[PDB]
C-alpha cells in the first residue's frame with residue numbers, strides 16, 4: 001500500500017500549526033494535520049481536531065510525496081515531544097513509530113544512536129548538533145570549552161544552562177558530569193525563555209540544538225545573539241525522517257533526499273524557511 | 280578479514296614511508312597521545328597510514344571486532360561512473376563494487392549518485408565545498424566574475440573523478456564553470472594544492488574539511504570561508520553488507536561520546 005500514516009510535532013520553523021480557515025479548508029503551503037485533543041486531564045477521551053501544518057519539514061514531506069509517490073494522513077503527537085524511552089516505553093514521535101501507529105515521522109527529529117536501534121533514520125536533511133548561543137563579544141569555543149567543563153576555574157564563573165529533560169541535558173550528563181551539575185541551577189523554561197535571559201545579561205551562554213540556535217540567531221532583532229562556528233558543534237548529526245525498522249520506503253526516501261540536497265532544492269527551502277536577517 | 284581501501288587525503292590519511300625493518304615510526308601528539316599507525320599497501324610497497332579516518336577505522340575495528348588489511352586505491356581516485364553500453368565506476372567506488380574492497384574508509388562524499396549502488400553509513404564528518412586561493416589572489420567566492428565567466432587568464436579546477444566533478448557536471452547551470460574546469464582538473468588534491476602554491480592554479484574547488492586545514496598549515500594559502508555547498512563523509516559498504524547498521528550505530532555513538540570531537544582536536548582543528 002502507498003497511503004501512509006505520518007506523525008509530526010509542532011516546532012517552528014520546521015513545523016508550524018494553524019487552525020483551519022473558518023470554510024474548513026487548509027489553503028496555501030499548509031497541509032491538513034489532525035490532532036487528538038483531550039477532554040480533560042483525568043480521562044482518555046478526546047476529539048480529533050483539524051489543523052493546518054506548514055514549514056521547512058512540511059515542504060520536505062511534500063516533495064517526498066511527489067518524488068516517492070505516496071499519499072499520507074498527517075497527525076500531530078499528543079503524548080511527548082520527539083521521543084524519549086521512559087521505562088522502556090517510548091513516547092513522542094519515536095513511539096508512534098515503534099508501536100506502529102505511524103510508518104514514518106516527519107519533523108525536527110534528531111538522529112541518535114538510541115533511536116536508531118528501534119527505528120530507521122533516513123539520510124540527515126539538515127545539520128544540527130549541540131551548540132552554544134552567546135551575546136556577541138563573549139569568547140567561547142564550544143561545548144567542550146574549558147569555561148564549561150570546569151566553570152569555577154574562571155572568575156567570575158560563567159553562567160550558562162540549557163532546557164532540561166531533553167537530549168542536550170542527557171548528552172551533557174553522560175559526557176561532562178561536573179558541567180551537568182553546575183549548570184543545573186541555570187536551567188531554562190524554553191528557548192524563547194532563555195534568549196531573553198541572554199539579552200538581559202542574566203545568562204552568559206545557552207547550550208541547545210544547533211539548528212534551533214542558528215534559526216533564532218538569524219532572526220534576532222539587532223542581531224546581537226550569536227552561535228559558535230559550525231566547526232565547534234558537539235555530537236554533530238541531523239534531522240531525519242524516522243521510519244519503521246525494515247521500512248521498504250527508506251531506500252526511495254534516502255535517494256529522494258540526497259537528490260534534493262544535490263540539485264539545490266534543499267538550499268532553497270533553507271533560504272525560504274531558515275535563513276534570516278543576521279549575517 | 281575486511282579489505283579496507285582508502286586514499287591519500289590529509290588530514291584524514293597521511294601516507295608515510297616504512298622504517299627499515301618494515302615497522303612504522305612510533306609517534307605521539309603534542310598533547311601526549313599515541314599516534315596509531317597501520318600498514319597500508321599501495322602504488323606496490325607497504326607504507327604507513329594514519330590520520331582521522333585511520334583512528335576511526337581502529338575504533339570501528341574494535342567496536343565491531345573485526346580484523347582488516349588496508350590498501351590505497353589503485354587509480355588514486357575517489358570514483359565516478361564512466362561509460363564503456365555498460366557503465367562502470369573508477370577509484371574507490373569501482374573497487375568497492377568489484378570486491379577488491381569490503382569497505383571504504385575515507386573522506387567519501389555522500390551523494391545520490393554513489394548511494395544508488397552502495398550503502399553509506401550515517402555521516403562521520405559534516406563539511407562542505409569551498410575555494411582555496413594563493414594569498415594575494417582575492418576573489419569574492421563562488422559568484423566572483425573571474426569565476427562565473429571562464430577564460431584562460433584565471434584558471435580554476437577541482438579533482439578528476441570526484442564528488443566535486445560529479446557535482447559540477449550534474450547541474451545544467453554549472454555548465455560553463457564545468458566546461459572550464461574539465462580542461463584543468465588535477466588527478467589529486469596534493470597536486471592541485473601544490474599548484475596553487477606554484478601559481479599554476481588559481482582557485483581550487485575542494486572539500487572544506489581539507490581546504491580549511493591546508494590554510495591553517497600552509498599559510499601562503501587561504502580559502503574563501505563561504506561554504507557554497509554542504510556535504511557529508513560516510514563509510515561505504517556494499518549493498519546489504521552485514522556491517523552497515525552496526526557501522527553507522529558506531530558512528531552515532533562516537534559523535535555523542537565526543538570521540539569524533541577528539542579526532543577533530545587531533546587531526547582537523
Ligand SMILES: N[C@H](Cc1cc(C(=O)O)nn1-c1ccccc1)C(=O)O
Pocket residue numbers: 082083108109110111128129130162163164165166167168169171208209210235237
Ligand atoms: N531534535 C530534538 C533534539 C534537540 C532538543 C534537545 C533538548 O531539548 O535538549 N537538544 N537537541 C539536540 C541534541 C543533540 C544533537 C542535536 C539536537 C530531539 O529530537 O530530541
